[PDB]
Structure 1
Amino acid sequence: SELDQLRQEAEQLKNQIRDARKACADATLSQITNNIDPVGRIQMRTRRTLRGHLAKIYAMHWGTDSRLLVSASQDGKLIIWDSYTTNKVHAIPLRSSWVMTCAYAPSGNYVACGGLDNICSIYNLKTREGNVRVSRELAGHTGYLSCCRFLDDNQIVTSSGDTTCALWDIETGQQTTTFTGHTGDVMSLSLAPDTRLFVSGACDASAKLWDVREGMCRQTFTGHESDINAICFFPNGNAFATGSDDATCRLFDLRADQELMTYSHDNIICGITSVSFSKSGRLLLAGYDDFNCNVWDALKADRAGVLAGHDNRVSCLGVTDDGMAVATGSWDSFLKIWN
């Protein structure tokens, strides 16, 4: 008996949430946008090719200054590039090659990385005596570090294959808050621009919204039929896009608490590795396993163009804060800048 009440209670609770969403569902984003002029021909060209990494790149991150960026590769290096000159500002050697994520701090003072080592190493880029040495090793997780993003020089969030995310205090090396909830490995997270909340895509085929201050899960978004490897906030912070093994990108609204759109096309069977919005949020840029980055009209739901320059998988994307350029990282060990 006792187990039935609870199982049945769980099911009815979904319906309310189910119907409540359907109550809000009075129109489709496509129908509303049917008025707008389509985006036109989006054909960009490679303005830079960053050459240096000796093996697959797993993630890269633009700096808030829209010029410098970090990259991480199994060659064992964090390379901090000057996208303008191509000049390598820092080449940081790692203790392990199994790196999965890197993150550039907003202030340009720090940079973080971690992976199958289960540690988030924070690297000081302006050490007392002009060197690049680890300043903290954030230990606590019981699974690979899948992603991480700085809030400020003293705080950073992380996601892990141990089905949790965490809030850390760099100053003390302690884990401030544990965001449990997911029933699968957490592959990606995304920080809201006001950093008051964040979303996280996982291998339970769901994204979750988390209150940074409260340390609680607010909403859970479903729809994807497979793992989520990339998740990304819409520039206004009230909506976000996800990329999945199920060959689709999907837009979700926070306030409406549901999916608005699905971005898919036949001839696209492979997974999505990265997603990113342009400065105004009109373009959705998705990195795919077939070596391409596809550019979508985020409102209209169709392909605006495609970036073909890489010989192996596009594993990471990034649009500058000043909206001027897009970065692509690839398993062919190159990064490229598109305009």
Structure 2
Amino acid sequence: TEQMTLRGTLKGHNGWVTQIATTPQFPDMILSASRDKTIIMWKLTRDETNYGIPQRALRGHSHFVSDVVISSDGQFALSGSWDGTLRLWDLTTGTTTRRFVGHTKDVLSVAFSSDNRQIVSGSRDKTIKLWNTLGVCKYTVQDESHSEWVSCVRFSPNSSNPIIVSCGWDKLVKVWNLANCKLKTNHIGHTGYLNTVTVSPDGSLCASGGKDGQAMLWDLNEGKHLYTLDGGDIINALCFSPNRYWLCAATGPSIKIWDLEGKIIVDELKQEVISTSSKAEPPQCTSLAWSADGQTLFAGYTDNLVRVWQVTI
């Protein structure tokens, strides 16, 4: 039966792992961000003595790098940072193409479109904003926006239509359609602020979570509240699987991998159980991302490590 083994663990950070992402073009790369103010591009050897080595280290920020995302070609990479700026990397030696100037506060969330021509940003400005790849502002959203910090935005894969998700700490999830830039809907739910949201690879769903730590499911186009599940104390990051209908929820002491059909927990990932006391005996898990193979998944922790796992039958 499909179950999990502890694969290995990476090392090479002085700051807490904030995000991880992986391009399906090169699954032999993997990319990471951290509060050591650098994004590290790795070189994955599949030896079990290690599991990878840092290849290069991209440098140049004056505050944390919150979120990071790959290009659809894997030849570019983009970052959002708490210095209020973004950078557009050339992941071959270094040498930033462009830095995006204009925010008054942190840039928390960021995402990179499928056509590689639209780039969004969530900010503690309380503004979602759109960005040309030339590094200028196609649009700015300041009407019908969140009344609190913007937690996470997403581009939605679709048949062709433009839809983007937005969720803030005002305990609401707003869906936006481009070329009118209007509220498609407002979804109400979750007591306490929202941390994260993520969209299905098919794109008709929004799995949302927050302080509540409950996983509520919404319909993108039907606009209906499907159901709610108790996901534990707090869920900081979510990521669907590419080759299954699972959903992997990142809670503090454990990662909870959920089968969706039927609705049940498959397993709970436990890491090293080393004796420590008392407020967070293991480090909290904060980010996670699947590989495109779907065999292996990765995790971000606050001990500066990325723990690897692998599915075993």
**Same topology, TM > 0.5:** yes
User: Is 1:187–2:151 an aligned residue pair?
Assistant: yes
In the other structure, the counterpart of 2:95 is 133
Tell me, in whole angstroms, the C-alpha distance in 2 between the residues paired with 1:238 and 1:160: 25
In the other structure, the counterpart of 1:16 is none
Q: CA deviation at 1:68?
A: 1.8
In the other structure, the counterpart of 1:249 is 215
In the other structure, the counterpart of 2:235 is 272
List runs of 5+ in structure 2 lacking aligned partners: 47-51, 273-281
Tell me, in whole angstroms, the C-alpha distance in 2 between the residues paired with 1:216 and 1:322: 37
Tell me, in whole angstroms, the C-alpha distance in 2 between the residues paired with 1:326 and 1:243: 20
In the other structure, the counterpart of 2:278 is none
Q: CA deviation at 1:323?
A: 2.6
Tell me, in whole angstroms, the C-alpha distance in 2 between the residues paired with 1:213 and 1:116: 29
Tell me, in whole angstroms, the C-alpha distance in 1 between the residues paired with 2:306 and 2:172: 29
> Structure 1 residues 213, 334: closer, same or farther in 2, change over 3 A?
farther
* Percent of pairs with identical residues: 24
User: Is 1:337–2:308 an aligned residue pair?
Assistant: yes
Q: CA deviation at 1:115?
A: 2.3
In the other structure, the counterpart of 2:76 is 110
Between Structure 1 and Structure 2, the one with more helix by share is 1
In the other structure, the counterpart of 1:71 is 32
Which structure is larger by alpha-carbon Rg, 1 or 2?
1
Alignment of 1:273-292 (within 5 A): 273-288=236-251, 290-292=252-254
Please say if residues 39 and 65 of structure 2, whose CA atoms lie closer than 8 Å, have aligned partners that are also in contact: no
Q: CA deviation at 1:150?
A: 1.1
User: Is 1:52–2:12 an aligned residue pair?
Assistant: yes
Please say if residues 150 and 157 of structure 1, whose CA atoms lie closer than 8 Å, have aligned partners that are also in contact: yes
Tell me, in whole angstroms, the C-alpha distance in 2 between the residues paired with 1:63 and 1:82: 13
Q: CA deviation at 1:294?
A: 0.9
Q: CA deviation at 1:218?
A: 0.9
> Structure 1 residues 91, 300: closer, same or farther in 2, change over 3 A?
same
In the other structure, the counterpart of 1:81 is 42
> Structure 1 residues 123, 201: closer, same or farther in 2, change over 3 A?
same
Tell me, in whole angstroms, the C-alpha distance in 2 between the residues paired with 1:64 and 1:214: 32
> Structure 1 residues 299, 199: closer, same or farther in 2, change over 3 A?
farther
Please say if residues 51 and 335 of structure 1, whose CA atoms lie closer than 8 Å, have aligned partners that are also in contact: yes
Alignment of 1:169-208 (within 5 A): 169-171=132-134, 173-180=135-142, 181-194=145-158, 196-208=162-174
Tell me, in whole angstroms, the C-alpha distance in 2 between the residues paired with 1:184 and 1:96: 24
User: Is 1:215–2:173 an aligned residue pair?
Assistant: no
1:22-76 C-alpha deviation (Å, 9 max, x unpaired): xxxxxxxxxxxxxxxxxxx653123232211122111111113233221111122
> Structure 1 residues 214, 83: closer, same or farther in 2, change over 3 A?
farther
Q: CA deviation at 1:98?
A: 2.0
**More displaced 10-residue stretch of structure 1: 244-253 or 88-97:** 88-97
Please say if residues 178 and 215 of structure 1, whose CA atoms lie closer than 8 Å, have aligned partners that are also in contact: no
One-letter amino acid of the counterpart of residue 150, structure 2:
V
One-letter amino acid of the counterpart of residue 164, structure 1:
T
**How many aligned positions are there?**
290
**More displaced 10-residue stretch of structure 1: 99-108 or 322-331:** 322-331
> Structure 1 residues 53, 111: closer, same or farther in 2, change over 3 A?
same
Q: CA deviation at 1:276?
A: 0.8
Please say if residues 36 and 64 of structure 2, whose CA atoms lie closer than 8 Å, have aligned partners that are also in contact: no
**More displaced 10-residue stretch of structure 1: 82-91 or 143-152:** 82-91
List runs of 5+ in structure 1 lacking aligned partners: 1-40
Tell me, in whole angstroms, the C-alpha distance in 1 between the residues paired with 2:224 and 2:2: 29
One-letter amino acid of the counterpart of residue 105, structure 1:
S
Please say if residues 63 and 83 of structure 2, whose CA atoms lie closer than 8 Å, have aligned partners that are also in contact: no
Q: CA deviation at 1:160?
A: 1.2
Please say if residues 42 and 305 of structure 1, whose CA atoms lie closer than 8 Å, have aligned partners that are also in contact: no
Please say if residues 179 and 210 of structure 1, whose CA atoms lie closer than 8 Å, have aligned partners that are also in contact: no
**More displaced 10-residue stretch of structure 1: 41-50 or 305-314:** 41-50
Please say if residues 68 and 110 of structure 2, whose CA atoms lie closer than 8 Å, have aligned partners that are also in contact: yes
> Structure 1 residues 259, 321: closer, same or farther in 2, change over 3 A?
farther
One-letter amino acid of the counterpart of residue 107, structure 2:
L
Please say if residues 218 and 225 of structure 2, whose CA atoms lie closer than 8 Å, have aligned partners that are also in contact: yes
Please say if residues 38 and 65 of structure 2, whose CA atoms lie closer than 8 Å, have aligned partners that are also in contact: no
Q: CA deviation at 1:217?
A: 2.3
